[PDB]
Structure formats: C-alpha cells, structure tokens
Design a protein around this ligand. Structure first.
Ligand SMILES: CCC[C@H](O)[C@H](NC[C@@H]1Cc2cccc(c2)CCCCc2cc(cc(N(CCC)S(C)(=O)=O)c2)C(=O)N1)C(=O)NCC(C)C
Length: 367
C-alpha cells in the first residue's frame, strides 16, 4: 500500500509518522508508540521541537473541556483534550475525527534530538487517559474506515543514530515487508501489548532464572521504548551471562561507550540472545533471536557503541531495538502479536536476527 516507508527515524530517539491535523492541516510528525494509547501533540512551543499545533488556526478543532496528564517511564505532560480531523497522507487520503490532547506543559518528554513533535498511542484502550472512554486513534480508524483491527510495523533503522526509516501499516500486513513464515504469540492482556515470555537463552545458554521472573509484572512490545529493558535481577543475570562470554560498572550501565576502529566489529565477541515465546497452542513455542548487532548500538573511520539493554524495575520491555530485527504484527482481532524476519533488517545484506520454531513446553508463567 502507500503506507510503506511512511515512517522515519532510528531506534535512538524513535520512529515517527507524518500526520496532517486540523482545518487547515498542520504538518506534524508523530512518534509511533505501542507502549501508550494516548494521541497527543505539542500545543505550545518548545526547543527541541521545531513545529507545534495551533488550535486557533484549526477551525475543525473542538475542545472537550478538560485537561489530562499522562506520565510515562520517560517524561510526562498535560494537555487540553480536544478533537480534530486528522489525515495521514500515506495510505488513506481521507479525514478522520479523533480525540487529541494538546500539550501545554511537558516535563522530560521532549528530549534533545527528537525529530517528532507529538506522540501517537497504539495500545489498548485500557491504558487511555483519563479513562477508557477516550477512543484511541487507531480504534477510531478501525471504526471509521471499516479496516480490520490490525496494524504492523517494520523498522529498518538498524544502523546508527540521514536516518532511513520504516513502515507503519494500518489495517493489516504488507507481505513485501517480511520473508518467511510468521509466528504468532498470544496477547496475554489487551492493555499494553503483553505477551508471554517462556525463556531467555543467552548464547545457547538458557538462563538459570525462573520462567516467572521474565513476566514478573508484564512483558510488553513497546515501540516507544528505545531499548530492551529487563527486570533488574533478570538484567543482572543477563549481564553476567554476556560478561561471562567475554559487574556493575559503566558500559553496562550506559555511562560509557566502547569504540572500535571501523574495521573491527565487536559483535562476534558477544552472544546471540533468544527470547522464547509461546506459540498460539500451549504445547508449542518459538524463539526470536536478536544478534549482537541489534543490542550493541553504534550511536568517520571509527565507531563508538553502547550496550543496548537497560534494567527495569517492574516490566520487561521489548523496545524498538528488539523490534528492528523483525516485522511486527499487532493483530488485535485475534489477540496476537506476530513476528517474522524483516528483509530490511540486514546490515551488509546479512541477517541480523533470526526466528525459529517450534519447541516443547512450565504450565503458565504470567502471575
Ligand atoms: C512499560 C510501561 C510503560 C511503557 O514504558 C511506555 N513506554 C513508552 C514511552 C513513550 C515515550 C515518551 C517520551 C519520550 C519517548 C517515549 C522517547 C523514546 C526514547 C527514549 C525512551 C523512552 C521510554 C523508555 C526508555 N527507556 C527506559 C528509560 C526510562 S530506555 C532508555 O529505552 O530503556 C527510553 C519510554 O518510556 N517511552 C510508557 O512509558 N508509558 C505508558 C503509559 C503512560 C501508558
């Protein structure tokens, strides 16, 4: 469809989509975020962003009468909850009527180097603010364009933070954006896009951790989270395993980069990490494997990288760094998350991620 390469960005600061808003249309760039389910834009100005949304100059704007605050793991913001007409040049050409928040105060939400100026929440209504009545952007498109309740991403920016992008397909799958077969894990709770992680295998070496700690609170697919966050002590074990292949110092914690003359690639010094996820039938499972290329992030005859895994307190987040390796399908209608190899996820024309299945299975791992 026309929806291919409608995204643009990297894993460092995010992937965004060009949207037209209001009457007449204001050209905004909207971060795509499967970790939240609120659609919001910058209603007043700010320094890292270069364009904002002017509600005065949109006659099709209407205010709903209340403000709302949204707090994320990174930053927060408060905005008027209006609604307005939105048009996505790529794929639709039609105007849609959607709730929208215009942000008039943001704390640590607009970071340096962002090229976007709003956020689009593609998660379930459960996470909407101030409640579940605010109808998500994507829920409106389903109900208004009688498209299927399905979207699918492809992020090809597996290089280094001009930035090549990817595709956001609304209404289903674009089969030129993957190769091979698709493995579907079910959605364990239709709030975040929570899935059931069965195992972690660090370079052939299963983790000693209990299966239950991987889904300690939730294990989610979050296009808004840059990295692969892990529950703290899961991270620790993971860190030791990777370290053992070579505790509590700067690179792992991200306060230092490691730099190599451009010729040497450190990736072979690291191990492939495998996430084993449950297939749609209990008995089976499968694994998505990101190689060192994805988690050793490069941020010219030398290159300077960072360890691309950070520790979380409650949740395990499959951020965009893990999602860049694959084509991700968010099938909300059959409550599943689909994974497949992504052709554009190929540095030097070699595969940077792999997907393999099936496998034999604890009884339940979600507490
Ligand atoms: C799982 C719970 C929610 C999930 O976290 C979800 N993640 C998506 C958010 C969205 C967001 C907001 C502001 C700025 C960004 C994006 C920029 C992306 C790049 C930096 C980044 C972002 C997040 C998160 C990180 N990282 C964690 C550090 C705080 S990191 C460095 O990649 O590991 C970096 C993050 O939380 N993005 C969330 O935060 N909140 C959802 C509720 C409000 C509904």
């Amino acid at each position: 469809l026309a929806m291919v390469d409608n995204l643009q960005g990297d894993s460092g600061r995010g992937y965004y989509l060009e949207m037209l808003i209001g009457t007449p249309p204001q050209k905004l760039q909207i971060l795509v975020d499967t970790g939240s389910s609120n659609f919001a834009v910058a209603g007043t100005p700010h320094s890292y962003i270069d364009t904002y949304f002017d509600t005065e100059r949109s006659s099709t704007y209407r205010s709903k009468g209340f403000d709302v605050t949204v707090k994320y793991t990174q930053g927060s913001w408060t905005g008027f909850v209006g609604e307005d007409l939105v048009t996505i040049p790529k794929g639709f050409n039609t105007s849609f009527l959607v709730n929208i928040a215009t942000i008039f105060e943001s704390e640590n939400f607009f970071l340096p180097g962002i090229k976007w100026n709003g956020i689009l929440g593609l998660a379930y209504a459960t996470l909407a603010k101030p409640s579940s009545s605010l109808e998500t952007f994507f829920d409106s498109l389903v109900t208004q364009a009688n498209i299927p309740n399905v979207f699918s991403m492809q992020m090809c920016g597996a290089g280094l933070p001009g930035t090549n992008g990817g595709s956001l397909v609304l209404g289903g799958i674009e089969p030129s954006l993957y190769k091979g077969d698709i493995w579907y894990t079910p959605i364990k709770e239709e709030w975040y896009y929570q899935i059931e992680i069965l195992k972690l295998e660090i370079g052939g070496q299963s983790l000693n951790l209990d299966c239950r700690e991987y889904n300690a609170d939730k294990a989610i697919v979050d296009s808004g989270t840059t990295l692969l966050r892990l529950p703290q002590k899961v991270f620790d074990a993971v860190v030791e395993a990777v370290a053992r292949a070579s505790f509590s110092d700067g690179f792992w914690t991200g306060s230092q980069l490691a730099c190599w003359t451009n010729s040497e690639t450190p990736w072979s010094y690291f191990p492939k990490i495998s996430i084993y996820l449950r297939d749609e039938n209990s008995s089976r499972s499968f694994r998505i494997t990101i190689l060192p290329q994805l988690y050793i992030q490069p941020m010219l005859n030398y290159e300077c990288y960072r360890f691309g895994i950070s520790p979380s307190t409650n949740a395990l987040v499959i951020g965009a760094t893990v999602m860049e390796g694959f084509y991700v399908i968010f099938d909300r209608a059959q409550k599943r998350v689909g994974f497949a190899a992504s052709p554009c996820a190929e540095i030097a024309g070699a595969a940077v991620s792999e997907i393999s299945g099936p496998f034999s299975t604890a009884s339940n791992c979600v507490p």
